[PDB]
UniProtKB/Swiss-Prot annotation:
GO terms for cellular component: sarcoplasm
Catalytic activity reported: Fe(III)-heme b-[protein] + nitric oxide + H2O = Fe(II)-heme b-[protein] + nitrite + 2 H(+); H2O2 + AH2 = A + 2 H2O
Location in or out of the cell: Cytoplasm, Sarcoplasm
Binding site for O2: H64
GO biological process, any: oxygen transport
The protein's name: Myoglobin
The entry's keywords: Cytoplasm, Heme, Iron, Metal-binding, Muscle protein, Oxidoreductase, Oxygen transport, Phosphoprotein, Transport
InterPro entries in UniProt: Globin (IPR000971), Globin-like_sf (IPR009050), Myoglobin (IPR002335)
List of residues binding nitrite: H64
Subunit-level organization: Monomeric.
Listed GO MF terms: heme binding; metal ion binding; nitrite reductase activity; oxygen binding; oxygen carrier activity; peroxidase activity
Binding of heme b, residues: H93
Lineage: Eukaryota, Metazoa, Chordata, Craniata, Vertebrata
């Protein structure tokens, strides 16, 4: 688990994200897709985006970033008590979207990069550690559901 002080750091920086969830969402997915191009292949609706300029010009990419981070926000605010969210999210990501755990790691790393890039004053090393733990917790619980399913 995280401590109370770690949860508070996580949700304090998350409050900054919420000022422009859509801009954050866009930068997170651009960082993901450019850093790890295999991840883009999982999204039929984004495979036509070749260049970073195309990704940045895509309103649908921006929309999807908003949807992803808003879902992630909901999870974070449960402070680990996220069984109701995490069961169906694991089931869709394992079964419908065929998303390896490693890609969850990649997007967590993209989030940490973007939050550090935009909020260094609320995202010093300790707060970065706490966000990395919160994202590790969610990934770790999703992994158990992947294992249950035999994916793969
Ligand atoms: O669409 N999940 O990023
Ligand atoms: O990031 N506020 O310095």
């Amino acid at each position: 688990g995280l401590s109370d002080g770690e949860w508070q750091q996580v949700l304090n920086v998350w409050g900054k994200v919420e000022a422009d969830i859509a801009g954050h969402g866009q930068e997170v997915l651009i960082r993901l897709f450019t850093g790890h191009p295999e991840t883009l292949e999982k999204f039929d609706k984004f495979k036509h985006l070749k260049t970073e300029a195309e990704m940045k010009a895509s309103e649908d990419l921006k929309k999807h970033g908003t949807v992803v981070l808003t879902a992630l926000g909901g999870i974070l605010k449960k402070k680990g008590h996220h069984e109701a969210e995490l069961k169906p999210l694991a089931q869709s990501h394992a079964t419908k979207h065929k998303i390896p755990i490693k890609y969850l790691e990649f997007i967590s790393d993209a989030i940490i990069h973007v939050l550090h890039s935009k909020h260094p004053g609320d995202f010093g090393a300790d707060a970065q550690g706490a966000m990395t733990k919160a994202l590790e917790l969610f990934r770790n619980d999703i992994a158990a559901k992947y294992k249950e399913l035999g994916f793969q």
